[PDB]
UniProtKB/Swiss-Prot annotation, chain B:
Domain of life: Eukaryota
Full protein segment contained here: 330 to 420 of 968
Tissue spec: Detected in fetal and adult kidney. Detected at the thick ascending limb of the loop of Henle, at distal tubules, including the distal convoluted tubule and cortical collecting tubules, with weak staining of the collecting duct. Detected on placenta syncytiotrophoblasts (at protein level). Strongly expressed in ovary, fetal and adult kidney, testis, and small intestine. Not detected in peripheral leukocytes.
Residues glycosylated per entry: 33, 46
Record gene name: PKD2
Disease per UniProt entry: Polycystic kidney disease 2 with or without polycystic liver disease: An autosomal dominant disorder characterized by progressive formation and enlargement of cysts in both kidneys, typically leading to end-stage renal disease in adult life. Cysts also occurs in the liver and other organs. It represents approximately 15% of the cases of autosomal dominant polycystic kidney disease. PKD2 is clinically milder than PKD1 but it has a deleterious impact on overall life expectancy.
Signal peptide start-end: none
Family to which the UniProt record says this protein belongs: Belongs to the polycystin family.
Protein name: Polycystin-2
Length: 476, 91
């Protein structure tokens, strides 16, 4: 026999793959790319004013942030409809935008008494233990009174420099430009962004009723304690009113079928986890099954948790004069996409378990399997020198090059040098003598001396496997 | 053309769906005057598909032939610009 079981095991896998492919096709349309592109180009490409040539991406001073927040920002937000405000006469700006900042207090750090006679105040790096909570300025409204993270219904962000909190001093802008401009001018007249600020957030959302699909926007400007301006942005095309069309019902049915399939697989895996064999971890085709099941279970858990709580949208729809809070939904959508992509990638990789239909594929699979052990053995030795080079580059160049700034960047730039992409002219001025020595020795050693070992091992293993297979056939 | 959710149906008033043959307009608009404001069938308009970047546009639609010299071409274009000819429904 040995063929009736494999046929069922293959047809069920093909059905599951078809269902997953339909499901992943249904979630990735073509309008979202252009939607995001128009939003980004409207908000991140237009200059601050007609004379200045700096956009949001090239902010370089705290004065430039004030110049941007009145001008390009207000031009993008409020459009004179031929009251409400449609972004492109298509995208509706629902609610009102909100701006908030995080600041620290004076005397946070300690200047040495040797030079205390000239330095009066200091402000350390951002930290939860050393953030200001006292009122300042004219002291009327929420822009000058500290508000707890719990009352703001926010969460952390994990910015480039650090992980900011959700608290701070916030202010809800108006619904029309004539009042938002006045509010921003009032915030600028009194000193609201002094040396003590560390971050500033601007966020809003749009609907674009033509295609039922939201879009949340967040703009973050970071002020490090060492000076400078670090901008950031994020656009997320959410979708919260899913069940409108027939295709949406079809997608829901496909999701239910996928849940049934994953239940059947977990049942049939827990069935054979002990019956056919106990403690079978030497196959690598069953260690993949548990990964598939775990990833899919996590995906369904995230999906069922995210869509179960949409009370924010309803409570906004009761009264549309307040700021909608859609941060958590966007975060969970990003997490769900990240999980689903990996899940489908492993599902596609799983296909290798069945392509053994003839001698040509069987011998190739045998060659690939037999050469895994020594390749793994040599990979450790290769990566030891690779990480030694990475740490050398990080220590020597990791402060004046902008490309070796952190360890991950050193790893990635060495991988790119393996591809022969990165030029060497930006290292000699960083360091005159050790720069080109590093580049030359690294390319000399890793480029062919330690790189063709993989090819040699693979070639020798394949040749000897083929020779043995041919020899045993003739011996029989 | 599409359907608008009832939760915010009071806010949004009109829907202009993405282009599709089954959702094309075949009705007069504006100051109805022959070629420039009456839908013309593809068979009568001598046309064919194009396969643009977004979708495959048919050969039908509203059209207006220009003239032979600059002056009254500019006059016709100014006429088409005064009477708004590019609404939100254009695709
Ligand atoms: C913060 O406290 C220090 C310590 O006295 C003082 O010199 C400084 O002026 C204070 N900062 C502000 C903004 O008042
Ligand atoms: C703060 O409140 C006072 C008292 O009503 C008011 O006159 C003033 O305009 C408000 N704003 C500022 C910046 O003082
Ligand atoms: C935060 O708490 C709830 C959210 O569930 C809401 O009723 C309240 O208005 C929110 N406060 C602000 C300032 O957004
Ligand atoms: C579009 O149609 C709806 C009802 O079908 C109507 O309320 C609305 O006024 C129309 N808008 C235009 C611009 O014709
Ligand atoms: C439409 O045609 C009539 C017929 O002569 C003409 O009187 C009218 O001016 C035309 N409309 C416009 C906007 O020119
Ligand atoms: C369009 O094709 C028709 C054939 O049906 C032909 O009579 C006509 O000359 C062509 N051009 C015109 C008049 O639009």
């Amino acid at each position: 026999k040995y063929l009736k079981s494999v046929l069922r095991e293959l047809v069920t896998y093909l059905l599951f793959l078809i269902v997953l492919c339909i499901l992943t096709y249904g979630m990735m349309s073509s309008n979202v790319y252009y939607y995001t592109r128009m939003m980004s180009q409207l908000f991140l490409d237009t200059p601050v004013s007609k004379t200045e040539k700096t956009n949001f991406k090239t902010l370089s001073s705290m004065e430039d942030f004030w110049k941007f927040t009145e001008g390009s920002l207000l031009d993008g937000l409020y459009w004179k409809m031929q009251n409400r405000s449609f972004i492109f006469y298509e995208n509706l700006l629902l609610g009102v935008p909100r701006i908030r900042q995080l600041r620290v207090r004076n005397g946070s750090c300690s200047i040495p008494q040797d030079l205390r006679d000239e330095i009066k105040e200091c402000y350390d790096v951002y930290s939860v233990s050393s953030e200001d909570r006292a009122p300042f300025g004219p002291r009327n409204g929420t822009a000058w009174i500290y508000t707890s993270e719990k009352d703001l219904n926010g969460s952390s962000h994990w910015g480039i420099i650090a992980t900011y909190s959700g608290a701070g001093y916030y202010l809800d802008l108006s619904r029309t430009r004539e009042e938002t401009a006045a509010q921003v001018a009032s915030l600028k007249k009194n000193v609201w962004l002094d040396r003590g600020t560390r971050a500033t957030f601007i966020d809003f959302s749009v609907y674009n009723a033509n295609i039922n699909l939201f879009c949340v926007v967040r703009l973050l400007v970071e002020f490090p304690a060492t000076g400078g301006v670090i901008p950031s942005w994020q656009f997320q095309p959410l979708k919260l009113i899913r069940y409108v069309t027939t295709f949406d019902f079809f997608l829901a049915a496909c999701e239910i079928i996928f849940c049934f399939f994953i239940f059947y697989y977990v049942v049939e895996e827990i069935l054979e986890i002990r019956i056919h064999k106990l403690h079978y971890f030497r196959s690598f085709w069953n260690c993949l099954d548990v990964v598939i099941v775990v990833l899919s279970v996590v995906a369904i858990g995230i999906n069922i948790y995210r869509t179960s709580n949409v009370e924010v949208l309803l409570q906004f729809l009761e009264d549309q004069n307040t700021f909608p809070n859609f941060e958590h939904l966007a975060y969970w959508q990003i997490q769900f996409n990240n999980i689903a992509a990996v899940t489908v990638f492993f599902v596609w990789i799983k296909l290798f378990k069945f392509i053994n239909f003839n001698r040509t594929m069987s011998q190739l699979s045998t060659t690939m399997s037999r050469c895994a052990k020594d390749l793994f053995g040599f990979a450790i030795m290769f990566f030891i020198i690779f990480l030694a080079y990475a740490q050398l580059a990080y220590l020597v160049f990791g402060t004046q090059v902008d490309d070796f700034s952190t360890f991950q960047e050193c790893i990635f730039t060495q991988f790119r040098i393996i591809l022969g992409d990165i030029n060497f002219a930006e290292i000699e001025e960083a360091n005159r003598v050790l720069g080109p020595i590093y580049f030359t020795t690294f390319v000399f050693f890793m480029f062919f001396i330690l790189l063709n070992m993989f090819a040699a091992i693979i070639a020798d293993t394949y040749s000897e496997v083929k020779s043995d297979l041919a020899q045993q056939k003739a011996e029989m």
